[PDB]
A paper describes a structure:
The dense glycan shield consisting of 22–23 N-glycosylation sequons per protomer is an essential feature of SARS-CoV-2 S architecture. The glycans have been shown to play intrinsic and extrinsic roles in protein folding, modulating conformational activation and immune evasion. The transition to the ‘up’ state exposures of RBD for the binding to hACE2 is also a prerequisite for S-mediated viral fusion, directly correlating with infectivity. Here, we dissected the role of N354-linked glycosylation, acquired by BA.2.86 sub-lineages, as a RBD conformational control element in attenuating viral infectivity.
To understand SARS-CoV-2 engagement of the HS cofactor and how the N354 glycan alters HS usage at the molecular level, we determined cryo-EM structures of XBB.1.5, BA.2.86, JN.1, and BA.2.86-T356K in complex with HS at 3.2–3.8 Å. Interestingly, incubation with HS led to marked conformational alteration, yielding substantially increased ‘RBD-up’ state in the N354 glycosylated S-trimers, but had limited impact in RBD conformation modulation for S-trimers without the N354 glycosylation. Due to structural heterogeneity and flexibility of HS, only the density for part of the HS basic unit, IdoA (2S) (2-O-sulfo-α-L-iduronic acid), is clear, allowing identification of the location of major binding sites and interactions. In contrast to binding of sialoglycan to the domain A (corresponding to the NTD in SARS-CoVs) in HKU1 and MERS-CoV, HS mainly targets a semi-open, shallow, elongated cavity composed of a number of positively charged residues on RBD, downstream within a deep groove, named the N354 pocket, constructed by the residues N354, R355, K/T356, and R357 from RBD and T157 and F168 from neighboring NTD, is occupied by the HS fragment. The HS fragment is poised to possibly interact with R355 and R357 through hydrogen bonds and a salt bridge, meanwhile residues K356, N354, R346, and R466 might contribute to further coordinate the oligosaccharide. Notably, the absence of the N354 glycan in the immediate vicinity of the binding groove probably facilitates unobstructed engagement of HS, in line with the observed affinity; however, the presence of the N354 glycan together with the bound HS widens the binding groove by 3 Å, pushing the neighboring NTD outwards and thereby conferring a relatively relaxed upper arrangement. We observed that free HS displayed a dose-dependent reduced infection of BA.5, BA.2.75, and XBB.1.5, consistent with previously reported inhibition in S binding and infection by authentic SARS-CoV-2.
Numbering used by the authors:
A (entry chain B): 298 to 618, 633 to 675, 690 to 737
B (entry chain A): 738 to 827, 850 to 1078
C (entry chain A): 26 to 69, 77 to 143, 158 to 245, 247 to 262, 264 to 297
D (entry chain B): 982 to 1078
E (entry chain C): 738 to 785
The structure:
């Protein structure tokens, strides 16, 4: 591994770095609140003739537990476009509040439910949030809403004067006042009333059929949980590196018993790092501290490849005294970290390959680690009337290499 | 690399491979800083390698060096000043996002032994322990050889060596209170400690950033967006997160250059303030410099410069 | 009516997270420090109907023994034309009715509230907000603090029953107002009032003429400002500092 | 040769940013090293101007031991100094006064 | 920070807040050099 990092077949000596320890998780526990009541999504799906686009039927779905099978009860799905959330994974995630809206429109207006566009619906009549964290569900219902006599009973406010803000009701008298004269609603001309009859008969073009369009809107990253697909509430574990799922947000780490306080309405544990580290049990009142599994950092100690091949491995900040999969010849517990593959000694020698915290390794036919030898212990005989005067010299010559300049470079 | 930029997601690490070779330069730069910060303390302290020991009877003249000599009473062998300095100078949240702190090679037990070595040599062998083999020399006689370096004759010390001992000892007794009077003196070291601490803190907080994406967290965006549209949100998350790391490493590079510039000054000052007696003005204290005594400190060194300043002047007529 | 200054009131939990001995800065609706809190007539005899506008939240504080103040009205027009909100703190169970009632100029549930318009889209039953009543202590015992915020169709109210014995207007101190319930409806609020409770006890004799337009509740408003606060090791909010006050702050 | 104008720009532009950022990083790192290489080069000039042209009384600057003189030697992108120093070797002790 | 990146437009300043804490470290960086450049002249000239 060290050779691969260095991009060479010979490594000289010293410490080296590789990928971290990365203790793998054992399994995943997914704890859900406790609510088992069936949520009535069929009411907003296949009721009687729904209202037109001029007056939507907004609903507030909450406190229930719901899944994605009852939505899949309907085959003729046409406008299955899903925004924000992928359709295949609308399960096992907890929203905070889901708003369901229903209306009936024609074929040429189905594509108008997309945000950031101008159309018949997207004009003054209806406005929708251009971020649109939710999704759109629609299917053909030309066999039910359509009538042989002609469904002229549905209107639509196309010609209203002012624009519209997203998520705003538009149901009013809407007198028409346009042109360079006050019509007052009686004059006659320039009335062009916005309301008009759709015209729904079972003999028409493909792009002019009635549909049941239900749009869903919601948001995420909220402490309370409202509605999510069922998942078996497996018993929790302690001190085991496990994946977890607590009403939405997931993560990997060990769970520890309560040591903090929290408040009756308080259930999160965000810290200065702004990462969740203390959560409450969704089922009962248990405070759990979330400390993700201990990261590593693997360091390889090697003498010369031209000298030997045996190596030693160092894990910085990882205790062993411990969850290290398989062990080796020996295990040491330096303050720097966990060292394996090297044999500690009792002597002291000059440092040649650094390890940390006053310890270095060396190659004796084996790799040995030791403390520091600062130098030979010398005691100088200091006396009130004693002096030592030299009687001979030694004219030595020493080098000293200092860089002066580096190669000049240019670019274009 | 990925541990900081992303999580346990292979797709995010796959998208980081598009950048490809940004890690190898980033990890190399920080390792170069650490390996040279580790070496940086070597020449400042390990100026002499003979580990001298003070004589059992600490009679270095009438001078009182108990305030600077290591005391065996403490579990860690340190002087009166060093223990005061240890207490006068004062994490996990960083250590789950990718950051670590490699321990220094030289612990304080050996660092204090290095200072004890120099201190023993600067007292028993005076300034000889920096030129060759140490040669003992009485401390009363050593002073008369430091006065001569300032154009003051031998006998000036000897007729009032009792006053010299009474006065240097009094000054060394006061330096404990003066250093303990306020914490403004240690501001040169507490500056480097919290500045690195706040540099790490401002790096951890940068992960919780809405860098043009729907959310800062990584796991949720996988469960939210499909492949054809999740990348356009996660890519701008990678660019910003990489930029924050790139900014941090550069700021460390300037700081590392500045720290070693001061460390070289300390090494040069350690190499002649105590190993000798400099004729340079103000380099080794204020006034005519006599000697100095090193004292270790967290992430730094402290020098107790001993100088000679005239005080009582009577003006005469000359020719 | 009368004007009174609120010193360090209107501090509440802005989110649902727990922090220990840290300093957190947040930006949202907050009652500014040292603001003009409208203190109404400090008697009770008295029966007034002040037109109170609702805008960007309302801080409501009013200590009162025997819980004479029980009701609460919200809305914009209150003539069964648009949606409205109502609270009854029936002192063993709280009832919340977001409906379209009719309401008189001088409402009074005891010795005549709506008499018509009784159909809507909300029913609620929970533990009453007020604690217990019939406290005839000579000195003041408890103080009530309430904050309402109608945003994102997520009508939130916060409460704080605290014991004070100082008998002089608002206590000078920081209060850790705590949220208790969230009501997602989505309504339009611009005006609000409240209701009292008192029995003549007999219809023939002196039915209703004893009252003048002088009915005492503190009303404060909220402004969007940054109010970096401080936590302790238990997690209860200790002190908060306003970032829009004097430059020292 | 692959993409048309309206959609080739969205790809080359991010290639432009990455190639420019790599150049910015290289130049920035050169600035720190160039400042560092001058820091030692100023020391070499000071050492050359004082160890070689004179006898420095400061200790440990012009070698190890009591310094006598120095002889400069050239080297690729650097300089080499041969510090000739005087160190004592044979130490008989005596009683002093 | 904002004055330089954007004019008197609130929407641009709201965009800057998405980065959050990028300008903070810029002001602190310029304050450190400025406070140290006034300290250079002190130790060069105020020696007596
Ligand atoms: O309950 C809801 O969520 C709906 O919110 C919107 C309507 O606003 S309104 O102005 O019309 O009242 C309400 O009547 C209803
Ligand atoms: C709606 O769907 C349910 C699901 O089975 C069915 O029982 C019911 O009859 C349907 N109602 C109408 C009006 O189609
Ligand atoms: C869920 O609620 C029921 C109430 O019927 C209760 O009996 C049960 O204990 C709750 N779940 C847990 C895990 O306590
Ligand atoms: C490796 O060792 C052999 C034998 O000692 C020697 O001939 C060769 O030059 C060495 N190579 C290196 C790169 O050290
Ligand atoms: C590892 O854990 C053991 C047992 O708690 C402890 O004695 C030892 O000091 C620990 N090692 C480190 C480096 O903290
Ligand atoms: C030296 O050997 C003794 C005898 O077993 C042992 O107790 C001691 O820990 C050893 N010292 C070191 C530093 O390993
Ligand atoms: C020097 O004299 C002092 C008393 O003044 C005495 O304590 C000390 O032991 C003497 N030292 C030696 C080495 O004789
Ligand atoms: C001094 O040492 C040298 C060897 O370095 C030796 O040749 C010479 O004889 C010595 N001088 C004396 C006086 O012993
Ligand atoms: C040196 O000073 C210390 C502290 O003032 C004192 O305790 C000690 O006795 C002194 N030494 C002598 C020899 O007086
Ligand atoms: C200096 O000495 C002279 C006599 O030589 C005397 O007159 C004078 O007052 C003294 N002080 C000053 C400041 O000149
Ligand atoms: C409160 O209103 C009064 C009456 O206008 C005014 O004099 C006073 O300055 C106001 N104080 C505050 C804090 O708004
Ligand atoms: C008041 O509360 C009691 C107990 O919950 C209930 O029986 C009664 O009907 C309530 N009265 C009203 C008007 O809601
Ligand atoms: C409730 O009142 C509203 C407003 O007057 C009215 O439109 C609606 O039909 C009423 N509902 C019932 C069930 O009477
Ligand atoms: C709320 O009512 C006021 C007063 O009629 C009106 O101006 C405002 O537009 C209304 N807001 C909404 C969201 O309906
Ligand atoms: C609550 O905080 C106070 C102030 O820090 C402290 O004295 C008290 O012990 C704490 N109570 C706990 C931790 O339950
Ligand atoms: C120093 O010389 C003396 C003789 O004067 C002798 O006794 C002693 O052993 C020598 N060495 C030391 C370390 O004192």
């Amino acid at each position: 591994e060290t050779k691969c990092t260095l991009k060479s077949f010979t490594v000289e000596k010293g410490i080296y770095q590789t990928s971290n320890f990365r203790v793998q998780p054992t399994e995943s526990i997914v704890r859900f609140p406790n609510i088992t009541n069936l949520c009535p999504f069929h009411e907003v799906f296949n009721a009687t003739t729904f209202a037109s686009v001029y007056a939507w039927n907004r609903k507030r779905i909450s406190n229930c537990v719901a899944d994605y099978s009852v939505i899949y009860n309907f085959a003729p799905f046409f406008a299955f476009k899903c925004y924000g959330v992928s359709p295949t994974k609308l399960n096992d995630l907890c929203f905070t509040n889901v708003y369901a809206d229903s209306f009936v429109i024609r074929g040429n207006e189905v594509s108008q439910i997309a945000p950031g566009q101008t159309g018949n619906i997207a004009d003054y009549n209806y406005k929708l949030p251009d971020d649109f964290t939710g999704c759109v569900i629609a299917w053909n219902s030309n066999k039910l809403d359509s009538k042989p006599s002609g469904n002229y009973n549905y209107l639509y406010r196309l010609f209203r004067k002012s624009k519209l803000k997203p998520f705003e009701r538009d149901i009013s008298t809407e007198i028409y006042q346009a042109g360079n004269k006050p019509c007052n609603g009686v004059a006659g001309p320039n009335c062009y009333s916005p309301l008009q009859s759709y015209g729904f008969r079972p003999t028409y073009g493909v792009g002019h059929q009635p549909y049941r369009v239900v749009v869903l809107s919601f948001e995420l990253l909220h402490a309370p949980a409202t509605v999510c697909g069922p998942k078996k509430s497996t018993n929790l574990v302690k001190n085991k590196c496990v994946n977890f799922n607590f009403n939405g947000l997931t993560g990997t780490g060990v769970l520890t018993e309560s040591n903090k306080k929290f408040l009756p309405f308080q259930q999160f544990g965000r810290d200065i790092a702004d990462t969740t580290d203390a959560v409450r049990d969704p089922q009962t009142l248990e405070i759990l501290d979330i400390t993700p599994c201990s990261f590593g950092g693997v360091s390889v100690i090697t003498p010369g490849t031209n000298t030997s091949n045996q190596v030693a491995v160092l894990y910085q900040g990882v205790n062993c005294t411990w969850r290290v999969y398989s062990t080796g010849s020996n295990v040491f517990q330096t303050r720097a970290g966990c060292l394996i593959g090297a044999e500690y000694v009792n002597n002291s020698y000059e440092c040649d390959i650094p390890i940390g915290a006053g310890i270095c390794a060396s190659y004796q036919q084996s790799i040995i680690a030791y403390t520091m030898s600062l130098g030979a212990e010398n005691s100088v005989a200091y006396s009130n009337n004693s002096i030592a005067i030299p009687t001979n010299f030694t004219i030595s010559v020493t080098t000293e290499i200092l860089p002066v300049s580096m190669t000049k470079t240019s670019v274009d | 690399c990925t541990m900081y930029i992303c999580g346990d997601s292979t797709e995010c690490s796959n998208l980081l491979l598009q950048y490809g070779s940004f890690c190898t330069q980033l990890k190399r730069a920080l390792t170069g800083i650490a390996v040279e910060q580790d070496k940086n303390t070597q020449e400042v302290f390990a100026q002499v390698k003979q580990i001298y020991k003070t004589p059992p009877i600490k009679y270095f003249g009438g001078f009182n060096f108990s305030q600077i000599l290591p005391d065996p009473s403490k579990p860690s062998k340190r002087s009166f000043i060093e223990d005061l300095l240890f207490n006068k100078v004062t994490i996990c949240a960083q250590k789950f996002n990718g950051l670590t702190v490699l321990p220094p090679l030289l612990t304080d037990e050996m660092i204090a032994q290095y200072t004890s070595a120099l201190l023993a040599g600067t007292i028993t062998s005076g300034w000889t322990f920096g030129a060759g083999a140490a040669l003992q020399i009485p401390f009363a006689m050593q002073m008369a050889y430091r006065f001569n370096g300032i154009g003051v004759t031998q006998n000036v010390l000897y007729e009032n060596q009792k006053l010299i001992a009474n006065q240097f000892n009094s000054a060394i007794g006061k330096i404990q209170d003066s250093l303990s009077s306020t914490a403004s003196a240690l501001g040169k070291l507490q500056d480097v400690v919290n500045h690195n601490a706040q540099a790490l803190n401002t790096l951890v907080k940068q992960l919780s950033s809405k860098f043009g994406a729907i959310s800062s967290v990584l796991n949720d965006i996988l469960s939210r967006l499909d492949k054809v549209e999740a990348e356009v949100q996660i890519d701008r998350l990678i660019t910003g997160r990489l930029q924050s790391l790139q900014t941090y490493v550069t700021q460390q590079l300037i700081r590392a250059a500045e720290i070693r510039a001061s460390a070289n000054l300390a090494a040069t000052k350690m190499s002649e303030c105590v190993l000798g007696q400099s004729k340079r003005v103000d380099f080794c204290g204020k006034g005519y410099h006599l000697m100095s005594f090193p004292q270790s400190a967290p992430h730094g060194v402290v020098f107790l410069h001993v100088t000679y300043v005239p005080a009582q002047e009577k003006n005469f007529t000359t020719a | 009516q009368s004007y009174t200054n609120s010193f360090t009131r209107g501090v509440y939990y802005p989110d649902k997270v727990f922090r220990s001995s840290v300093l957190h800065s947040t930006q949202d609706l907050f009652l500014p420090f040292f603001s003009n809190v409208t203190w109404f007539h400090a008697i009770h005899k008295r029966f007034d109907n002040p037109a109170l506008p609702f805008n960007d939240g309302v801080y409501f504080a009013s200590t009162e023994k025997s819980n004479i103040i029980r009701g609460w009205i919200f809305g914009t027009t209150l003539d069964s034309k648009t949606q409205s909100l109502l609270i009854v703190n029936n002192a063993t169970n709280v009832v919340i009715k977001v409906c379209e009632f009719q309401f008189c100029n001088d409402p009074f549930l005891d010795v005549r509230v709506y008499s018509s318009a009784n159909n809507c889209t909300f029913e609620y039953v929970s533990q009453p907000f007020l604690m217990d009543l019939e406290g005839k202590e000579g000195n003041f015992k408890n103080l009530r603090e309430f904050v309402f915020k109608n945003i994102d169709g997520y009508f939130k109210i916060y409460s704080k029953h605290t014991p004070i014995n100082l008998e002089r207007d608002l206590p000078q101190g920081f209060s850790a107002l705590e949220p208790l319930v969230d009501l997602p409806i989505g309504i339009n609020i611009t005006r609000f009032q409240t209701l009292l409770a008192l029995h003549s006890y007999l219809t023939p004799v002196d039915s209703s003429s004893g009252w003048t337009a002088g009915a005492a509740y503190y009303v404060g408003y909220l402004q969007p400002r940054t109010f970096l606060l401080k936590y302790n090791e238990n997690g209860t909010i200790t002190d908060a500092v306003d970032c829009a006050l004097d430059p020292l702050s």
